[PDB]
From a paper:
NMB0315 is an OMP identified in Neisseria meningitidis as belonging to serogroup B. The development of a universal vaccine against this group remains a challenge. Although few studies have been dedicated to the uncharacterized protein NMB0315, sequence similarities suggest that it is a lysostaphin-type metallopeptidase belonging to the M23 peptidase family. Proteins in this family are characterized by a conserved active site containing an HXH motif, and all are zinc-dependent. Our results suggest that NMB0315 is a zinc-dependent peptidase and belongs to the M23 metallopeptidase family.
The structure of NMB0315 was solved by single-wavelength anomalous dispersion at 2.4 Å resolution. Two molecules of NMB0315 were present in one asymmetric unit. The overall structure consists of three spatially separated domains: Domain I (residues 58–151), Domain II (residues 152–265 and 397–420) and Domain III (residues 266–396). The 2Fo-Fc electron density map reveals a metal ion bound in domain III. This metal ion is coordinated by three spatially adjacent residues (His295, Asp299, and His375) and two water molecules (W142 and W141). Two other histidines, His343 and His373, take part in interactions with the metal ion through the water molecule W141. One possibility is that the Zn2+ was replaced by another metal ion such as Ni2+ during the expression and purification of the protein. In our structure, the short β3-β4 loop of Domain I stretches into the catalytic center of Domain III and forms numerous interactions. Based on these interactions, Domain I of NMB0315 is capable of tightly associating with Domain III, which blocks the active site and the substrate binding groove, suggesting that full-length NMB0315 is in an auto-inhibited conformational state. Based on the comparison of NMB0315 and other M23 metallopeptidases in their active form, we propose that the maturation of NMB0315 requires the amino-terminal domain to be removed.
Author numbering: 57 to 95, 102 to 245, 250 to 262, 266 to 420
Write the structure that this text describes.
């Protein structure tokens, strides 16, 4: 009898194009065209979804883009015969995720079995990197986490930042709390003291135009993930290394324009882009010496620096990880205490 609509999932293979994946799914030739007419692009490690109507006609197509610098969540619907970027306020919903796990084999291993996003395992590693090694957790060691999770139409699509984390290694308790204020946040321990190389910011900037993490466009309601920090600064402004390490690259790089990377050791790297010019200071960099100057090369509006920290792999909120953490004043102390208590109430849920 009558046919019902169904979803088709097509994974994205190496250096694949949208039209490519869309074609392997079985989508019509002329249909692929009407789509790519308005929409180095397709984020690998995923799969584009296509809703097929009972009549075999495509009605929707959602997927993630991995453009250089940021990733976009593209949702497209077909109405009246035209593909339009679908979006709405109620589409996404962020919830606090309470995950508790006890180490058995390895720390990173057990956390993976507990359904803990790779992003979080690495973000957690850098946060406590100044107290212990996340890989030195023996059996019986606990890891209690609380982090925002993004749900698209009731379906978990990503993971926000860590709100609080309690780790017990060998019986020693280590706590980390996320604190935000003013008109990104930072991580502090239970006593409000700084946790933990990166003793300075990459430069002197006028203001931070765009923070790290997921954010919804105020009017388009679309969602995008900025894989770094946008430091607004006059072009030509000296861009120095945040810490020691060794520069491993430099030159034009996709939408990043001129950029350089530094392997700060311990399995961590950094990247500064959109530079107007370098300064050629390869080899080992003491940490602090100029390595570039602000510009607007690659995919960028005006002058500013793109700071991106990549722990054991890909993008990770550089805050309190690959940047210095400011001390808490009275303009905080009280507020922080109020926030620490809220997170601890959720933590106690995993004890
Ligand atoms: Ni950026």
């Amino acid at each position: 009898g009558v046919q019902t609509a169904y979803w088709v999932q097509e994974a994205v293979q190496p250096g694949d194009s949208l039209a490519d994946v869309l074609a392997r799914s079985g989508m019509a030739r002329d249909e692929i065209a009407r789509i790519t007419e308005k929409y180095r692009h397709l984020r690998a490690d995923q799969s584009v979804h296509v809703l097929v109507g009972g009549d075999g006609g495509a009605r929707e197509v959602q997927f993630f883009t991995d453009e250089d610098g940021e990733r976009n969540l593209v949702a497209l619907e077909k109405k009246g015969g035209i593909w339009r970027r679908s979006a709405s306020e109620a589409d996404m919903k962020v919830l606090p995720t309470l995950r508790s796990v006890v180490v058995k084999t390895s720390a990173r291993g057990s956390l993976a079995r507990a359904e803990v996003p790779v992003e979080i395992r690495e973000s957690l590693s850098g946060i406590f990197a100044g107290r212990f090694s996340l890989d030195g957790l023996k059996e019986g060691d606990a890891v209690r986490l609380i982090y925002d999770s993004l749900y698209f139409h009731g379906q978990q699509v990503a993971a926000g930042d860590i709100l609080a984390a309690e780790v017990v290694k060998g019986g020693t308790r280590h706590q980390a709390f996320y604190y935000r204020s003013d008109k990104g946040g930072n991580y502090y321990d239970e006593d409000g003291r700084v946790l933990q190389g990166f003793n300075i910011e990459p430069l002197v900037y006028t203001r931070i135009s765009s923070p790290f993490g997921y954010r919804m466009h105020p009017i388009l309601h679309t969602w995008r993930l900025h894989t770094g920090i946008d430091y607004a600064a006059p072009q030509g402004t000296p861009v120095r290394a945040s810490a020691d390490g060794v520069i491993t690259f430099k030159g034009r790089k996709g939408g990043y324009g001129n950029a350089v990377m530094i392997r700060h050791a311990n399995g961590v790297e950094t990247l500064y882009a959109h530079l107007s010019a370098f300064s050629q200071a390869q080899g080992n960099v003491r940490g602090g010496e100029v390595i570039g100057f602000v510009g607007s090369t690659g995919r960028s509006t005006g002058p500013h620096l793109h700071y991106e920290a990549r722990i054991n792999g890909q993008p990770v909120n550089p805050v309190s990880v690959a940047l210095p953490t400011p001390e808490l004043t009275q303009a905080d102390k009280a507020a922080f205490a109020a926030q620490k208590q809220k997170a601890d109430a959720l933590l106690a849920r995993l004890r």
